[PDB]
Each structure stands twice: as C-alpha cells, then as structure tokens.
Amino acid sequence: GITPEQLVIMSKDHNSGALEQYGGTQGLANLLKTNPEKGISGDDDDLLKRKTIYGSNTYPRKKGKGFLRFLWDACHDLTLIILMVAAVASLALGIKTEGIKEGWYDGGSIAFAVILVIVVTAVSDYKQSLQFQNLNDEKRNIHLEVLRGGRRVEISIYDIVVGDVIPLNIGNQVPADGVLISGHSLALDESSMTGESKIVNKDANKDPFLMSGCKVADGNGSMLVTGVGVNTEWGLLMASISEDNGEETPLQVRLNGVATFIGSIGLAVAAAVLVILLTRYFTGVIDDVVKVLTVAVTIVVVAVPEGLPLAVTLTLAYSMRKMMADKALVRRLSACETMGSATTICSDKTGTLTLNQMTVVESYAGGKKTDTEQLPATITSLVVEGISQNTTGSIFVPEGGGDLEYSGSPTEKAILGWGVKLGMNFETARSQSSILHAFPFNSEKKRGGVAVKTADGEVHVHWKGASEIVLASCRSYIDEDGNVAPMTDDKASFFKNGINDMAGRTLRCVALAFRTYEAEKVPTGEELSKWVLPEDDLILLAIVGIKDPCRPGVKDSVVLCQNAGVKVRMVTGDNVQTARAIALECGILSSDADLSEPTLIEGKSFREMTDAERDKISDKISVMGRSSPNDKLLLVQSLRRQGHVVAVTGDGTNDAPALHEADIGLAMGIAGTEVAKESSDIIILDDNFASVVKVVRWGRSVYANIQKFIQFQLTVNVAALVINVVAAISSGDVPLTAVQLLWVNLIMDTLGALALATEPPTDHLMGRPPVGRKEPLITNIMWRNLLIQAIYQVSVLLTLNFRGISILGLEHEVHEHATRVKNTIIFNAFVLCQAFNEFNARKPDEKNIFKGVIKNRLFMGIIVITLVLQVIIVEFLGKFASTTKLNWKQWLICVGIGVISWPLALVGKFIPV
Numbered sequence: 001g002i003t004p005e006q007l008v009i010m011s012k013d014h015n016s017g018a019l020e021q022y023g024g025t026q027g028l029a030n031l032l033k034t035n036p037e038k039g040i041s042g043d044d045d046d047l048l049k050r051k052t053i054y055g056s057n058t059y060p061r062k063k064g065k066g067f068l069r070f071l072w073d074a075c076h077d078l079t080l081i082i083l084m085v086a087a088v089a090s091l092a093l094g095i096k097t098e099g100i101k102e103g104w105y106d107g108g109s110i111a112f113a114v115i116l117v118i119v120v121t122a123v124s125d126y127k128q129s130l131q132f133q134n135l136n137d138e139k140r141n142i143h144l145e146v147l148r149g150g151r152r153v154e155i156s157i158y159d160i161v162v163g164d165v166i167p168l169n170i171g172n173q174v175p176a177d178g179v180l181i182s183g184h185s186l187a188l189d190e191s192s193m194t195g196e197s198k199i200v201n202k203d204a205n206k207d208p209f210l211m212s213g214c215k216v217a218d219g220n221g222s223m224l225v226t227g228v229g230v231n232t233e234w235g236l237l238m239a240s241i242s243e244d245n246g247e248e249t250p251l252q253v254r255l256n257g258v259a260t261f262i263g264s265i266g267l268a269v270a271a272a273v274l275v276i277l278l279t280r281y282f283t284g285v286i287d288d289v290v291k292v293l294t295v296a297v298t299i300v301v302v303a304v305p306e307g308l309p310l311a312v313t314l315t316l317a318y319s320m321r322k323m324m325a326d327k328a329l330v331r332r333l334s335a336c337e338t339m340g341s342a343t344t345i346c347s348d349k350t351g352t353l354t355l356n357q358m359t360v361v362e363s364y365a366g367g368k369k370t371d372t373e374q375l376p377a378t379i380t381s382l383v384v385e386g387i388s389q390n391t392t393g394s395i396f397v398p399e400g401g402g403d404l405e406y407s408g409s410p411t412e413k414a415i416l417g418w419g420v421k422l423g424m425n426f427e428t429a430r431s432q433s434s435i436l437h438a439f440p441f442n443s444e445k446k447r448g449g450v451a452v453k454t455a456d457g458e459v460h461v462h463w464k465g466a467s468e469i470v471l472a473s474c475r476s477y478i479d480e481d482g483n484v485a486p487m488t489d490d491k492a493s494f495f496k497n498g499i500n501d502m503a504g505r506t507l508r509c510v511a512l513a514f515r516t517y518e519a520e521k522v523p524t525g526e527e528l529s530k531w532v533l534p535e536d537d538l539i540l541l542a543i544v545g546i547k548d549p550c551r552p553g554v555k556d557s558v559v560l561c562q563n564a565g566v567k568v569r570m571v572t573g574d575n576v577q578t579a580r581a582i583a584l585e586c587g588i589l590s591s592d593a594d595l596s597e598p599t600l601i602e603g604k605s606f607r608e609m610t611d612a613e614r615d616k617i618s619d620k621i622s623v624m625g626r627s628s629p630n631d632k633l634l635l636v637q638s639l640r641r642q643g644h645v646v647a648v649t650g651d652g653t654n655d656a657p658a659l660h661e662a663d664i665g666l667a668m669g670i671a672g673t674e675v676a677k678e679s680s681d682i683i684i685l686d687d688n689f690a691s692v693v694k695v696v697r698w699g700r701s702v703y704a705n706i707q708k709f710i711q712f713q714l715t716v717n718v719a720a721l722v723i724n725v726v727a728a729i730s731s732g733d734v735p736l737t738a739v740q741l742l743w744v745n746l747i748m749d750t751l752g753a754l755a756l757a758t759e760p761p762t763d764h765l766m767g768r769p770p771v772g773r774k775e776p777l778i779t780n781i782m783w784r785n786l787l788i789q790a791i792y793q794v795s796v797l798l799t800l801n802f803r804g805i806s807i808l809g810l811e812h813e814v815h816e817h818a819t820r821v822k823n824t825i826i827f828n829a830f831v832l833c834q835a836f837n838e839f840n841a842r843k844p845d846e847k848n849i850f851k852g853v854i855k856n857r858l859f860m861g862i863i864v865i866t867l868v869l870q871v872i873i874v875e876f877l878g879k880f881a882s883t884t885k886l887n888w889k890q891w892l893i894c895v896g897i898g899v900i901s902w903p904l905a906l907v908g909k910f911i912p913v
C-alpha cells in the first residue's frame with residue numbers, strides 16, 4: 001500500500017538514506033494519512049487503522065511469580081531431586097517395615113529438609129524480586145500533547161500512533177521512533193540508545209531521524225512519529241532480548257557435579273550391600289526383605305548430602321543481604337557468586353565510567369591554566385558575574401537551599417557548574433546586575449553576548465562563545481590577580497595553542513571575554529535589538545574546556561579490579577577518539593598499543609568477521625568504539641565461546657543484549673535504563689565502580705564459604721556412609737539411624753553455614769586471580785582435610801559400635817539398654833565431632849586463633865543446648881532419634897571424643913599427609 005512496514009526499512013537504512021525515495025519528510029505527509037496541520041483525522045477509525053497496520057506503542061511487560069514458579073525452580077534442583085526420590089523410597093519402605101502406618105516421623109526429617117529448602121528459596125527470591133520490581137520502576141516517560149489538529153490533548157505516550165506530529169522541547173523525552181518535520185536547532189542526547197556522549201544535532205534535511213527513548217538536550221521542534229512499539233529500534237532491541245534459556249551458573253553446575261558424584265557413590269555402595277546381604281540371608285510370605293531394604297535406603301539417605309541445598313541457600317541469602325547493606329542489589333541468589341568467578345568485565349563508557357554530564361575538566365585564567373582549584377578574587381568576581389548573567393540555563397534550587405540541580409544545554413550546565421565551583425551563588429549573582437541587553441547563543445553567530453549594569457555606574461559587555469572566534473574578537477586579557485593587560489602576539493599564540501591542544505582532547509572549548517564599554521545605556525536606545533553590542537577590544541577572562549569526565553574514584557576501582565585478575569575492557573558506541581581518551585583517563589587502556597587493531601576495533605570491523613573469525617580477536621579487544629548493540633552481543637558471545645565468564649556493566653538500552661547474554665550483567669541503578677536494568681542480574685544502586693569491586697569481593701567470599709561448608713558436609717556424609725555400610729555388612733544394623741543423621745544434616749548445616757558466613761569478606765581474596773571455571777569445587781586440600789576427619793570419625797564410631805558395651809562402663813546390665821546407650825554415645829559423639837570440625841573449618845589451612853564472633857558463639861551454644869535437650873529428654877523431642885538418657889560420665893566421654901577432633905585437625909592442616 002503506502003509504507004506497509006517499508007518505513008521500518010527506511011529507519012533501518014543509513015541516515016538520510018532512502019528517505020529521498022519517498023519524497024522526504026514532507027513527502028511522507030499524505031502517507032500514513034499525515035497532514036502537518038492535522039496529524040489525525042477526526043474519526044476514531046482513522047486511529048484504529050494506525051493501531052492495527054503500524055501497531056501500537058505498548059511494549060509487552062514480563063510477568064514473574066505467576067504461579068509459585070520459584071518453588072518449582074527450587075524443586076528442579078538435581079541434588080534436591082535425588083533427595084526427593086530417596087525420601088519417597090525411605091518413607092514408603094519404613095512405613096511398610098513397621099506396618100503401623102501412623103505418623104510421619106520415619107521420613108519426616110527428610111521431607112522437611114527439602115520443604116525447608118523450597119520455602120527458604122521461595123521466600124528469599126520473592127522478597128528480592130518484589131524489592132527489585134519496586135526499585136527499578138522508574139517513570140522516565142513524560143506525558144505530553146500529541147499535536148494533531150489540537151484534538152485529544154495530553155494522552156499517555158502509549159496512545160501515540162504512527163502518523164501524528166508531536167512536539168519536543170528541551171529536556172523532553174522522545175517517545176517513539178520518528179523523523180523531525182520542523183525544528184529550531186534541535187539536538188538530542190542519544191547516549192541512552194547509541195552511547196554517544198556528545199549531543200546529536202538534528203536537521204529536517206541533514207539528519208532527520210529521532211530515536212525512541214531519547215532526551216532532547218537542546219532546541220525544540222515538531223516531529224512526525226514513524227515507528228511505535230516493537231517496530232521501534234528500542235522495541236526491536238527489547239524484542240531481541242526476550243528469549244532466555246540454556247543458563248547454568250558455574251557454582252550451580254559444580255554443586256550438581258559434586259552431588260551427582262556422591263549420590264552415585266552412595267547408590268552403588270548401597271546396591272552392593274543390598275545384593276551381598278540378600279545373598280547372605282537367602283544362603284548364608286515375606287522373607288524379612290523389608291528390613292534389609294530399609295537398611296539400604298538408610299545407607300542411601302546418609303550417602304547423599306541432605307543439608308547442602310539449605311547451606312548454599314542460606315549463604316547466598318546472607319551474602320545478598322550483606323551486599324544490599326552496601327549499595328549493590330542482586331536479583332537472584334545464584335548471581336551472588338557468579339560475579340566472583342568473572343574473568344573479564346566489559347563496561348559501557350557513557351553513563352558507566354563517566355558521569356555522562358558535561359563538566360569543566362581544565363580551564364585558563366589570568367594567563368595560566370589554573371584548572372579547577374580556586375581563581376583569584378579579582379578575576380573570579382568578573383567570571384562568576386559573566387557566567388551568571390550570560391547563561392539561559394539556571395540552577396534549580398538556589399533559593400530553596402537544597403542540592404543544586406543545573407538546567408539548560410550541556411554547555412550551559414557545565415559553565416554553571418564551573419561558576420558554582422568558583423563560589424557563585426545564582427540568587428545573589430543575578431542580583432546586583434541588570435541585563436540591559438542579551439543576544440543569545442546562535443548557530444549563525446557562535447558567540448553569545450550580554451550587557452550587565454553592575455551596581456556601579458559602568459556597564460560590562462560579556463561574550464561567551466567558541467574559543468577561536470572569541471579570541472579573535474578580543475585584543476586584551478585579564479591577567480591573574482591584576483588589571484587588564486594588552487594581549488601581545490606571543491600571548492595570543494599561547495592562547496591559541498592552548499585552545500588547539502584542548503580541542504585535541506575530547507573536551508570542547510568555550511571562552512569568556514568582557515569589555516568595559518560604558519557611558520551608554522540600552523534602554524536609552526529606541527530599540528533594544530538595535531543595540532550593536534560592540535565586539536571590539538574584548539578582554540579575555542577564562543577559556544574553559546568542558547567534557548564528559550570519568551566518574552570520580554573510578555580509576556582506582558579499575559586498578560583494584562585488574563589487580564584481582566579480572567581484565568576490564570570498554571564496549572561503547574561513542575566515536576573511537578572519545579572512547580580512547582576516556583579509557584586512558586579511566587585506566588582501562590594503557591598508553592602502549594593504543595592504535596593497534598586488536599587493542600581497539602570499530603563495530604563494523606568486528607561484525608564484518610564470521611562468528612568463527614570473531615573469536616581469534618575477541619580475546620584482545622580492550623576498547624571498541626562505534627559498536628552497535630548487536631556488536632556488543634557478538635563480543636559477549638565470542639568471549640563466552642572462548643570460556644570467559646563475562647561480566648557486563650552498562651546503563652543504556654544498547655547494552656541490554658550484552659547484559660542478557662553475559663554471565664553476570666551489572667546495571668547502574670540510576671543511570672541505567674529500564675531495559676538494561678531488567679536484563680541485568682545485579683543492578684548497582686551506588687552508580688559507582690567501588691560497588692563493583694565490593695561485589696567481586698563478596699562473590700569470592702561466598703565461594704570460599706561454600707567450599708568450606710562443602711568440606712564439612714562431605715566429611716559428615718563420607719564418615720556416615722562408611723559407618724553404616726560396615727555396620728550393615730558386619731551385623732545388619734545401622735548405628736546412625738536415618739532420622740538421627742537427617743537431623744544432624746539439617747540443623748548442623750543450617751547453623752554452621754551461616755556461622756561460617758559471619759566471616760566478613762577480606763581483601764586477601766582480591767589478591768588471588770579469579771577461579772578457573774574448571775578447577776574442582778573440592779580442592780585437594782579440602783579432600784585431605786575431610787578425609788582425615790572422616791577416617792578418625794569412622795575409626796572411633798566403628799570401634800564403639802563393635803565394642804562399646806564392654807568399653808563403656810556398666811557393661812550389658814540389660815542388653816537392649818546397653819545397645820541403645822552405645823548407639824546414643826556413637827550418635828552424639830558424631831554430632832560433637834561435627835561441631836568441632838565446623839570449628840576447624842571456620843579457619844582452615846592455618847593454626848586456629850580460637851577467637852570466634854559473637855554470633856558464632858551464640859549458635860554454638862544453640863547447637864549444644866539443642867543436642868543436650870534432644871538426648872536428655874525423650875518426650876516431645878528425641879522420640880524419633882531414639883536416644884536414651886545419658887549420665888554425666890557418658891556426656892563427658894562424648895565431649896572428649898569430640899575434642900579429640902581438634903588436635904588431629906591441626907595436624908592434618910600442618911602436614912601434607
């Protein structure tokens with residue numbers, strides 16, 4: 001018909017490309033039923049047609065927690081699945097073995113383990129998700145008139161449809177993709193969508209293309225909307241990020257591997273025991289096979305780590321809470337760890353690593369650079385009056401007394417920030433001075449002039465403009481702390497060289513001058529516009545250079561990140577020169593190999609290569625300018641294909657694909673766009689890089705704590721498996737009942753995990769490089785430690801299980817009572833050995849300092865008191881553990897058996913054996 005989605009092609013094509021084939025912006029009128037006076041026909045069918053054919057501006061919104069989804073995700077844990085199958089088996093087998101079919105104590109503990117895991121994960125993730133939903137919800141959209149025949153004024157941005165001409169002013173936000181149909185020096189801030197720091201100047205013929213989700217930095221004009229909804233570049237980017245799948249955290253896969261290994265070992269050994277013992281029974285209605293089967297499922301239960309999911313969830317939740325105590329928010333528990341293993345960090349430039357606000361970086365004043373610092377009073381007074389009386393923009397709340405917020409174009413904002421830094425107060429600066437005449441900033445005439453009648457009789461003429469023309473129009477200057485001085489040829493050459501060097505860097509160049517011409521008044525003149533405002537013999541005050549600078553204290557953070565083995569690179573859509581300058585300032589890119597192709601490549605060069613040939617180079621890309629969002633996605637994909645655990649810190653919508661495809665996507669809390677924050681696993685509410693370093697440290701500490709608990713849990717499981725298997729083959733009885741060890745796993749894990757988690761992160765973790773993504777979760781040192789502890793426990797508990805009635809005093813006064821007492825001694829000595837092994841694991845690979853934290857002591861007291869209560873009283877607690885009362889001598893024997901763990905733990909720590 002007439003632009004049936006050909007308009008998406010028009011926008012896709014190069015700037016000012018393919019728009020001439022359609023007759024230009026005006027030719028596009030009468031197409032899409034657009035009239036410059038009437039953007040919409042009077043009827044509503046004329047709007048429904050645009051809603052249907054060209055779509056609607058509403059973007060679909062993702063929905064989470066639809067129906068207990070997080071509980072299902074928790075249930076999908078592989079180790080948890082092993083636990084569920086073992087739990088069902090044991091419950092049915094025991095309930096048939098006893099035949100009572102009353103109560104749920106036999107499998108109650110094993111069911112409660114997974115129930116607790118599910119509940120804890122669901123609660124923690126629900127809280128985190130709702131908190132993130134509340135925080136990230138930012139009303140960036142600004143509702144405005146649509147300007148179509150003066151009808152349906154002030155409709156929400158979601159009601160704008162293709163074919164209607166909407167107006168845009170300074171500070172507004174471009175709602176939908178469009179082409180400007182008229183304007184007055186309009187200029188957009190596309191840094192959100194394209195990543196270019198400098199504002200883009202839009203013309204009705206040169207660059208007639210306005211992008212959705214853009215901030216109008218300067219000027220104003222009316223624009224025809226072309227793309228709305230998914231058809232927009234914003235919409236298309238949001239569409240190319242929806243699909244998420246094939247993800248598994250390195251920690252998650254490592255835990256799955258360890259759980260699968262231990263579970264397979266347990267299953268194999270239990271099956272061997274079952275087969276051998278059945279052969280013994282048959283040859284060595286029901287034939288007592290049920291008792292053997294309950295023994296076998298008990299062995300299988302003690303084999304698998306029941307409390308591992310509980311401990312990992314508790315550690316991740318505690319570390320997420322501690323991170324949120326800092327100014328970094330983690331969306332999911334798993335992410336809390338994945339950032340520790342990150343091997344490279346790709347950081348946006350505009351918004352991330354740079355304030356994104358133009359401000360003065362250097363300056364000139366009194367014949368000297370005198371960058372920032374504090375200017376002399378004599379020159380400072382004139383400079384501040386000129387900055388106050390020659391700027392259209394103004395500070396938001398000088399009268400109110402709150403934090404100052406600047407307005408106007410980035411040039412005006414930076415000049416005003418400089419004036420404020422110099423000690424200017426806008427309320428008073430504007431006072432004591434009346435603007436007789438004001439010729440504002442003009443594209444035709446670069447300079448901007450003003451006439452200020454100071455409180456004194458004489459009147460000043462201020463000129464703020466481009467450095468070259470202002471300098472050419474001035475023949476004198478105000479030297480430091482002194483009166484006017486003629487500018488000699490050498491001084492003019494010095495100023496011009498300074499301006500040229502300043503322009504060599506990314507920063508722009510704005511110069512201020514003042515002429516003391518007086519004795520005449522603009523009001524006395526018949527017409528203010530007729531005031532020539534003479535431009536001759538000006539006196540230069542201070543040349544000022546304004547650029548988008550690196551965030552404060554970002555170079556040091558990058559230095560720390562690099563020291564931690566985590567390389568940092570920059571992926572940005574800004575031109576190569578600006579990216580190179582900002583990288584050098586921020587420390588990402590060192591001085592050497594600055595211009596080499598691998599060190600910095602443009603987006604087009606990177607994408608030209610095949611996905612196979614985008615990998616031999618992706619390992620060296622330190623900077624990347626003019627990179628499209630798909631090029632950021634390609635870089636992330638290539639880095640991941642090479643085995644990197646890529647983190648991406650970005651703010652704009654262009655970074656959304658890179659954030660999503662990345663292993664760990666970090667998004668700035670305030671600067672970040674809604675799309676970037678949605679696709680990020682962590683959103684940095686600090687808007688700072690020190691928070692990123694802290695997050696890396698917290699992830700490494702989380703991994704260390706998980707490793708320590710894994711050591712402890714493997715010790716417990718491998719001691720109990722041996723004890724039960726040997727006891728079953730030797731006599732057919734299991735000392736460690738299923739419920740006893742289920743309680744041990746549950747309580748000891750849920751308490752010791754957080755007890756070790758109390759260890760605050762230490763800078764030591766930053767010294768070592770990141771984990772290799774392939775090293776086993778259980779390092780050989782942890783294997784030796786857990787093996788030594790498990791061997792000791794096996795030895796003591798087996799010698800007890802076999803000779804305890806004789807070894808323990810008061811031997812066999814009643815055989816059943818003596819057997820129960822011996823089993824209780826074995827069980828609670830096992831518990832105490834586990835507690836003291838937790839003590840050891842708190843500070844591994846060194847001599848224990850034996851100085852715990854208050855919370856650790858409190859939880860040790862809790863463990864001791866709960867164990868003592870469980871053993872000592874058999875009613876309402878200890879019924880299921882089947883434990884008989886113990887006398888003081890027996891309890892002393894148990895605490896001695898536990899204490900013996902510490903010396904051998906130390907010996908194993910200090911001996912490679």
Ligand SMILES: [Mg+2]
Pocket residue numbers: 191192195348349350351352650651652
């Ligand atoms: Mg950005």
